[PDB]
Scaffold this active site. Structure first.
Site, PDB file in Angstrom:
ATOM      1  N   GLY A 176       0.791  -1.267   0.000  1.00 13.12           N
ATOM      2  CA  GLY A 176       0.000   0.000   0.000  1.00 13.12           C
ATOM      3  C   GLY A 176       0.807   1.294   0.000  1.00 13.12           C
ATOM      4  CB  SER A 177       1.741   3.963   0.898  1.00 16.23           C
ATOM      5  OG  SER A 177       1.511   3.334   2.181  1.00 16.23           O
ATOM      6  CG  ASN A 178      -1.682   6.171  -3.633  1.00 16.11           C
ATOM      7  OD1 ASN A 178      -1.399   5.095  -4.141  1.00 16.11           O
ATOM      8  ND2 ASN A 178      -2.954   6.520  -3.305  1.00 16.11           N
TER       9      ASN A 178
END
Lengths: 751, 746
Positions: A176-178
């Site tokens: 995950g994560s941007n």
């Protein structure tokens, strides 16, 4: 007695965000530990049982951990062995001995501040009613906080094998994560723009806590830490802003041990016997009837790291008379991460941020992106601590047994531990033994943008792909990107092209705040129309020999505009559908490295029957949930606070959302509630820039600062996030004291 | 041609009328599917071992049941291995023709509803278009029937049986009151199985009227075609789980170098292999084959005991098999069929003894004209002698005896350790009829899942084989202490209800009374010990317990819908450490009133438990003095219907036992509750003929769209017993009567 005292001024502003002000690092730790405990005592107190390996004594050996986290939810008894055995007193000694004085002080302070709050919670009051009278709400030590810090470093390696390590006996995931960093050619302005968007836990001790630390003359930094950590891990100061996303680079490998015949706790090293190092551990465990019994295991280390029971991966891999297996996590010997965030918290330029990142080479399991006041270019790097193996080694060192996992764990080195030639390598510019040298880890600067959404370093910028770094960092031009990655770079290109429907063609702070919440669904934008063309005419079907009337589902999906906003109708039918579409042979246009955002594509006409099966299942699941097919997303996807279901927007990355609000709850069990322990989701968000007036940051902490239902900061931030209303977090002294909700108190005590 | 007339009455209760057993089966199969297709269709995957192909080998069973919730792949292996084609053949070969006919009809009627569900409609929207909604065979119904028999033995070890490779059933109350107790011309039968609210073992209420053969009403598990708990014009009965063990283990002495052969008095015997392939669906939607070779011994299937204790691994030298007596018992369905037709209690008893088939439950019955009520644990039970248990229990068997007392764990290398057969054993290796416990009383018999010992507290039963459970050496549960107390106080006229007789009307009230034995007996001593002062220090923290003390002192120790604070007592009592709690030990001379006497030394621990209970209630959002009906509820049509009753662990008799933690929205009954009030019946035989009042607490249909998904539940919430029509005139005169005929060529 030298009269030393901790003294911290705690200023709280809107959403209860604490801005700790102190004359030294100890006092800053004292204030930060106090405010974390004041807002999250129950989550933290439970967590210190985990790191000390004392869960089973209080809560029973066979119960699972209460909260999800980087450890997952093993049984208490296995978690206790794991922590005692890997985070031993030696590992703590080792960790503490590598620390600058100021951080040893800050951690002593943090412990004292946590304990001051514990005394206040024991004394009386209504806060933390859920746990304040429990025996496991108790003072902690600095060493306990170092246990917790060390634990955080292990997420990419040992943490994922807690149960396996706790149960390694002789015969006798992270995602995950941007983030974006936009340079000054992209913002059109004097500074770049930093977007930080970790997808992470909404409950438990890995969740983020937002604060500011002002340490007179030394640091003035704001952002988040995991609960129990004393420095800011994602945040900004007057000069630099940064964030992190999970990196594809593997952080661990396995060593296969050839055992001494007659002696299964010894192994051969180029023909010489080496003893494994034993640890006899006794964990006290509460019995379902109330008594406590001792549980004892002797567990082991090799020179590579702890022994690990791989029989769950494949029964052939049991520890036998002939073979055993160890796990090495590069971070097990990496004592440098906390100091690295500390130095970034104090950094006065992007150039300095970059030098610190290279000098420490410590970042344990994440990519980094940063923007610095006055710097035209944004920075992307996967520069951290990473296992070093050569392709020659991967060929000569990999064992027959290693195949049994070669599909389950690609790129993980599974080496013959018998041969010193197979040990991990050290480069002339390696900061740590067995780790990749700095010049061989990927990074990029750009004056347009860099972004990452958890694919490899390859496409930090789509116009300038990166290649030629060690295979352990991940593929570079040969794998398709995830739908989220394709969504994330599509949004960046469309912003700079001025074709995404927002104002102008610059990544300004204001337009970035809007874009990152827009909740486009890549799988629907690219494929929904082809699917409907393929199966909706006629809309009366036969599926598994049953008459299925799909006219309403076809109509709702045709009227839906492929976004998961609060008012969007039918978006949950798409989630229930797309998530069930079998993937084999689905696309007719395969991945092309020269078109990585738009391939694979092309719905296979042969998939028509299976698409109708999936749709028929999706219509049934939505009907079973009691929601209408055209229900607005905010009614399905929600967070309850104060008895009110706050409507939400966003979705799961598997659907190709960039705006992530990803419930673990099945739609048939009350919708996509965010109230339990959701999948990794928008958590701390920040949009930071450096205009003429000084650093400006807009933030969310989606699940709110405090885990206590009685707290005024249990659901205030969540209500703002539901409304799309970014918080302008005060940062200068005048901003803090001028805030509409400003309050100040001072806490002090003798060291 | 099958032809059945389906008459439905209030709550949707179907009364199937047919000219023969085949057609009665057709009608019954059709209505069960019409109301419960999605649960049933999902269940036929289970019994055929076809879950993984459709739902993924890794997913657990959707529904709780006697099988528990193992992974699909393990369930599929267990079913294919234990419920083999041979097991099905053998079962069917022992059946009377009319029951083979009835099961053929049931398959055909189920399949008829499947055709109608596939053709259109919005009933069973949740599953009507899935591939696993599909026609079944009579053999598949036999698979289901055989599976229900294994609840006391094989079913509990399904995973262990599916993974045996070379190198928990609880609940239910019932009373039988005789004519001395009712003051009337008949007894009164109270049936109260505590059972599943969802899944294929849940009950379905119906009547079957088979021209000149049978006229019976009550419940079946879904998929079963005869009435298991019910009544007819002459006899009524019920069942509760029996403490008697129904299985044992044989420790095997392996043949050297041959870990799939074992010694029998020195001669090698080969285990029988079955190479089984189960297709399993993958997470990306492809399907791939899983293969295991599994084994039978002459005792029954090999079983993996490594989980019970690592030392019991199937090694070179040793393996273990499990024998469930019901694995060879093909008699149970014929037994219920014959009771469904029985014309008197004497005949009911004669059938019970003749068949000796009842697989894992006690039975209580009352008959028309009969002074005395009947209790028995007469059924199929492993037969081992005391001499043999001493001579045959292996050293491993002794160690496991501590956790599993009275399960014979025997040396299977010695033929003299095979289970015994007596002169009056109906089945080989099973206890003879004259050595199984029973009792007739003209006052009452009762059982709440303790052993046969106190069927009636004034006349205890002793001296029966050890395998039936303890009889004087173990304390009774709080629920058994509450259930007998209630019967005594009814007949003494000291329970607050009308008169001193167990009339149908009074028993209907008493069984829903929701008294809480732990509070009635111990709350006062607890509050005397810890409530003064009510400001405490608990683990170094100041705790204000004044509201908790006040609310508990004002609570009258009942879990009724309006009772305030009863949930704080649940959160507290369930947390009290039990070691050393009581100062008056268990005494066989006074089993209702011992153990008792709260130990003053427990005061700190009681404060800790109460502090944690206050904390848990606060975290849930409910007030300490919330009324129970707000905490404990069933949602139907979007309304939370208030409920009453509680968990056996607190000493409730009226059982409404949520599995949901109170901090997760309270004691919701909406998921998969613990064994709870399910089908209830109070039946008597006045001069006008059998009269029954009933509940099916969760309602007849599993389909949220059905008018019968929540109607009976709304009645149960209101405490309004359903007078179920039984005669032709009652049925056709019912306010909600509708009729329809279903027919098709055979």
């Amino acid at each position: 007695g030298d009269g030393s005292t901790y003294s911290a001024e705690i200023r709280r502003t809107t959403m209860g965000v604490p801005h700790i002000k102190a004359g030294n690092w100890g006092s800053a730790g004292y204030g930060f530990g106090y405010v974390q405990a004041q807002d999250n005592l129950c989550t933290m107190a439970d967590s210190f049982l985990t790191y000390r390996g004392e869960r089973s004594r209080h809560l029973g050996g066979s119960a699972q951990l209460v909260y999800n986290s980087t450890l997952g939810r093993p049984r208490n008894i296995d978690s206790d062995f794991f922590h005692r055995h890997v985070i031993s007193d030696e590992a703590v000694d080792r960790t503490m001995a590598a620390q600058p004085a100021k951080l040893l002080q800050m951690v002593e302070g943090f412990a004292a501040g946590y304990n001051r709050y514990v005394r206040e919670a024991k004394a009386g009051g209504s806060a933390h009613a859920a746990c304040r009278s429990e025996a496991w709400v108790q003072p902690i030590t600095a060493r306990d906080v170092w246990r917790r810090i060390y634990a955080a470093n292990l997420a990419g390696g040992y943490s994922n094998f807690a149960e396996a390590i706790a149960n390694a006996q002789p015969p006798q995931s992270l995602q995950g994560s941007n983030m974006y960093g936009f340079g000054t050619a992209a913002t059109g302005e004097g500074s770049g723009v930093l977007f930080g968007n970790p997808h992470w836990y909404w409950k438990g001790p890995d969740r983020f806590y937002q604060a500011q630390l002002t340490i007179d003359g030394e640091a003035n930094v704001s952002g988040v830490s995991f609960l129990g950590l004393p420095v800011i891990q994602i945040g900004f100061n007057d000069s630099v802003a940064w964030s992190h996303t999970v990196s594809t680079a593997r952080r661990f490998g396995f060593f296969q041990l050839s055992l001494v015949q007659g002696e299964p706790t010894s192994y051969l090293r180029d023909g010489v016997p080496v003893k494994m190092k034993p640890a006899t551990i006794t964990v006290p465990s509460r019995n379902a009837d109330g008594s406590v019994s001792d549980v004892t295991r002797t567990l082991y280390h090799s020179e590579f790291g702890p022994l690990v029971n791989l029989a769950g991966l494949n029964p052939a891999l049991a520890w036998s008379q002939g073979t055993a297996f160890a796990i090495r996590d590069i971070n097990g010997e990496n004592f440098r991460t906390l100091r690295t965030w500390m130095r970034w918290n104090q950094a006065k330029s992007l150039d300095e941020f970059i030098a610190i990142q290279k000098e420490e080479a410590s970042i344990p399991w994440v990519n980094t992106v940063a923007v610095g006041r006055g710097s035209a270019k944004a920075w992307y790097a996967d520069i951290g601590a990473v296992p070093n193996v050569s392709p020659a080694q991967t060929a000569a060192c990999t064992t027959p047994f290693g195949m049994a996992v070669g599909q389950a764990l690609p790129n993980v080195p599974f080496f013959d531990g018998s041969r010193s030639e197979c040990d991990w390598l050290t480069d002339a510019d390696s900061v740590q033994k067995g780790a990749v040298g700095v010049s061989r880890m990927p990074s990029l600067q750009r004056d347009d943008y860099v972004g990452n959404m958890n694919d490899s370093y390859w496409l930090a910028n789509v116009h300038a792909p990166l290649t030629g770094y060690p295979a352990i960092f991940g593929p570079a031009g040969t794998s398709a990107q995830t739908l989220r990655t394709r969504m994330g770079h599509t949004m960046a290109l469309e912003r700079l092209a001025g074709t995404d429907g927002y104002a102008g063609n610059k990544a300004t702070s204001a337009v970035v705040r809007e874009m990152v919440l827009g909740s486009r669904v890549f799988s629907a934008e690219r494929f929904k129309d082809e699917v409907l063309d393929l199966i909706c005419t006629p809309a009366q079907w036969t599926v598994n020999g049953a008459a299925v009337d799909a006219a309403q589902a076809c109509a709702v999906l045709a009227a839906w505009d492929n976004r998961g906003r609060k008012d969007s109708r039918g978006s949950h039918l798409w989630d229930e559908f797309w998530s069930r579409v079998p993937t084999a042979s689905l696309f007719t246009v395969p991945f092309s490295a020269a078109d990585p955002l738009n391939t694979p594509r092309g719905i296979n006409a042969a998939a028509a029957d299976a698409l109708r099966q999936a749709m028929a299942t999706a219509i049934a699941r939505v009907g079973q949930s009691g929601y209408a097919l055209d229900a607005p997303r905010g009614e399905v996807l929600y967070a309850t606070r104060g008895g009110t279901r706050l409507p939400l927007y966003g979705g799961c990355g598997a659907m190709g959302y960039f705006t992530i609000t990803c419930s673990e709850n099945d739609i048939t069990q009350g919708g996509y509630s965010m109230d339990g322990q959701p999948n990794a989701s928008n958590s701390y968000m920040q949009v930071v820039s450096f205009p003429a007036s000084g650093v400006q940051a807009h933030t969310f902490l989606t699940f709110s600062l405090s885990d206590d239902p009685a707290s005024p900061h249990h659901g205030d931030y969540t209500k703002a996030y539901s409304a799309g209303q970014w918080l302008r977090v005060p940062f200068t002294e005048a901003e803090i004291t001028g805030n509409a909700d400003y309050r100040t108190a001072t806490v002090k005590e003798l060291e």
